Every structure is written in C-alpha cells, then in structure tokens.
Amino acid sequence: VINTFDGVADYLQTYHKLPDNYITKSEAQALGWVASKGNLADVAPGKSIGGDIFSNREGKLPGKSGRCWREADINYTSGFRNSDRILYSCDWLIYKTTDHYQTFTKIR
C-alpha cells in the first residue's frame, strides 16, 4: 504493497497506523540504508520510509501540537526517494505534497 495517496490515506483513517511496508529513517539506517547511494530497495526490499515526525516549522500546515504531524513516502518502489509525501495529523487530517513539502493540499 500500500503506497498510493488514496491507499495510505484510507488505511490511516481506519487502522490508525501506516501499513506494514513502512519503516522510519532510523530503522532504515540500522539496516544499512545509505541515502546517498539510494539503496533502500536493496537493504529493505518492498519498504518505504514513513512514520517520522514532521516539524511544521514553517507553519505550511494547520498548527498542531509538537509531535502531531507525521509523514510517509508515497509512490516509492526503488532508487532515490521521490518528492511525494503524505502528511497525517494526530486527529487524522490528511495532506499531500508532490513538491517536497513546498505546498500542501487536503486529501482527507
């Protein structure tokens, strides 16, 4: 797998968690992921980076408490990470970005 905008959106709203194909950056690093080599697929076949706290330091997203915004990679399969991300709040507001957190639009 679930790594589409709709799929992860629907999945979070229900289960209240990301699907089983997500790993945080720290977890990925421990498995040997080297961002500069874009090898995530080799060290963690079928996984995508997701579940880490998004700071919202630029307030480009509705203000929430300290660790209420989280992000997950969307449309990732192999190679370097792309520019697609889903942003989900502790109150389950769902936003998307396709430009590397520059701009956001509501999806749920």
From Swiss-Prot:
GO cellular component labels: extracellular region
Active site: 71 (proton acceptor), 100 (proton donor)
GO molecular function terms attached to this record: RNA binding; RNA endonuclease activity
Root EC class: hydrolase
Family (UniProt): Belongs to the ribonuclease N1/T1 family.
Designated name of the protein: Ribonuclease
Protein source organism: Bacillus amyloliquefaciens
Keywords: Endonuclease, Genetically modified food, Hydrolase, Nuclease, Secreted, Signal
Disulfide bonds: none
